[PDB]
DNA sequence: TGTCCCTTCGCGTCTCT
DNA sequence: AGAGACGCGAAGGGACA
């Protein structure tokens, strides 16, 4: 390993090496995965209690331990799982897997024992429930948040206004506790000074790095509207993500130059400039706008459109490459380039559309119009490489047409959608009746799998909002609304009827 | 060279309808 | 249905032992 001692690297790669047997067959990605942040001595902790850990009182599956070893401190976290998991459990009401999920950050061993002692209080002298408490905990840093609202939430709640859910949200990120703190220190000037409401500073708060972004809210707002004129509604939008002081601190510095030096509206960078990576984002369309307007390339309007995501920056870098190869040698025209971009991960749509548009129309039957319709979604990866992997077993073991595959797939989620009507076919049909048309259209939106499980747990298990809404009203509510038309119509039984 | 905490970037999914 | 919201992993940086 590092420079120390020497050539017992073997024993490394055999340790290593034992972890591929069993209990745990571990591949390559997972010990790449455990070495890249847990470090060596995670990876010899794995290994020292892989029967421990995968039996006695936690049963933990191989994915579960490789989620605690890969931060850290992962050796102190698997440590602790092994002492907490079962009175966590057992004494708190916590699943197994709320458990792996405290555990799975840096620190994960404070985090633990942090919630060992402090739930009880948290929901019983400040009436947070355990999962909300999971949520605080569940982050790097999660003793210090949980121990901060332990502190914090009454006088966040009496003195300045705020509900116990929002802080909850403040508290539910990566330096909650610097957030949280920050709220407390800077919300009355942000509003009495700047013109803020109490629900702005939460939005701007309620990411990671939130101190940051508030300390830089307090410091550019002014600038930012009264001398480059900008109103505070626009601040705002750009504060309220995580890297918010790197977007206003960019915005500051490039809105003249991308206002002026290439013509685009104040709105227009202010919209480049409300994702994650915002700042990322500017420059690089500050690089790159006149490129992709040069043998003919876009518009202005498209290069806002693709850079005007989370990842924005990584859809132009990558437009910008695969445009002439997309066009030249699959046939697609830049209006379809530009759609399959302009989405969350429009750099992995684009590299799989690579090399998959070939592969999905041979060994599947696809039209190239179906492999655009999915990957110009948001999750475009995920839909194409899951259409890959299911189409056969959807098709044949379960009757469907490619076509209704496809439908399923055209939509952001659609690898959830399909791995769910592939699990909640079966008992949709044959044991309550549903046809696959309309378990088909229920899947075929946004909020796909969530509205095929809430269906199902109405349908299973007859939830208290009862009889009336017959097996073809609650189908016509999961296509309309998904989930939640589902739970609102609970939640309005429950009193009203 | 490990453990803890904090910040930023990017990817994926769902809500609002 | 397009924008705006939710979640969460990877990675990098600083403090301290």
Do not use: F, Y
């Amino acid at each position: 390993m590092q420079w120390s001692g020497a050539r017992a690297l073997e024993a490394l790669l055999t340790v290593a090496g034992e972890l591929r047997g069993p209990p745990l067959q571990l591949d390559t990605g997972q010990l790449l995965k455990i070495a890249k942040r847990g470090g060596v001595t995670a990876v010899e902790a794995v290994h020292a209690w892989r029967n421990a850990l995968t039996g006695a009182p936690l049963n933990l599956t191989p994915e579960q331990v490789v989620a605690i070893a890969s931060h850290d401190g992962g050796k102190q976290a698997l440590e602790t799982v092994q002492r907490l998991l079962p009175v966590l459990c057992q004494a708190h009401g916590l699943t197994p897997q709320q458990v792996v999920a405290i555990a799975s950050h840096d620190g994960g061993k404070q985090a633990l024992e942090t919630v060992q002692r402090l739930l009880p209080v948290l929901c019983q002298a400040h009436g947070l429930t355990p999962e909300q408490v999971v949520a605080i905990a569940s982050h790097d840093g999660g003793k210090q948040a949980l121990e901060t609202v332990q502190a914090l939430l009454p006088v966040l709640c009496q003195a300045h206004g705020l509900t116990p859910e929002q802080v909850v949200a403040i508290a539910s990120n990566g330096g909650g506790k610097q957030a949280l703190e920050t709220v407390q220190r800077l919300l009355p000037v942000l509003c009495q000074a700047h013109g803020l409401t109490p629900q702005q500073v939460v939005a701007i708060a309620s990411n990671g790095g939130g101190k940051q972004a508030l300390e830089t809210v307090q410091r550019l707002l002014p600038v930012l509207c009264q001398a480059h004129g900008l109103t505070p509604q626009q601040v705002v939008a750009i504060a309220s993500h995580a890297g918010g002081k790197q977007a206003l601190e960019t915005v500051q510095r490039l809105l003249p130059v991308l206002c002026q030096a290439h013509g685009l509206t104040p709105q227009q960078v202010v919209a480049i400039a409300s994702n994650n990576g915002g700042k990322q984002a500017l420059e690089t369309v500050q690089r790159l706008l006149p490129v992709l307007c040069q043998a003919h390339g876009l518009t202005p309007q498209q290069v806002v459109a693709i850079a005007s995501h989370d990842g924005g920056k990584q859809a132009l870098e990558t437009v910008q490459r695969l445009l002439p190869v997309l066009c030249q040698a699959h046939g697609l025209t830049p209006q379809q380039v530009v759609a399959i971009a302009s989405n969350n991960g429009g750099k992995q749509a684009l590299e799989t559309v690579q090399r998959l548009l070939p592969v999905l129309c041979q060994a599947h039957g696809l039209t190239p119009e179906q492999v655009v319709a999915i990957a110009s979604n948001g999750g475009g990866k995920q839909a194409l490489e899951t259409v890959q992997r299911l189409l056969p077993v959807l098709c044949q073991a379960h009757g469907l047409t490619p076509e209704q595959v496809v439908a399923i797939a055209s939509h952001d989620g659609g690898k959830q959608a399909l791995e769910t009507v592939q699990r909640l076919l079966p008992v949709l049909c044959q044991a309550h009746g549903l046809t696959p048309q309309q378990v088909v259209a229920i899947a075929s939106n946004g909020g796909g799998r969530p509205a095929l499980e809430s269906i199902v747990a109405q349908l299973s298990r007859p939830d208290p909002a009862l009889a009336a809404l017959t097996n073809d009203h609650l189908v016509a509510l999961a296509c309309l609304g998904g989930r939640p038309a589902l739970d609102a119509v609970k939640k309005l039984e429950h009193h009203h009827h």
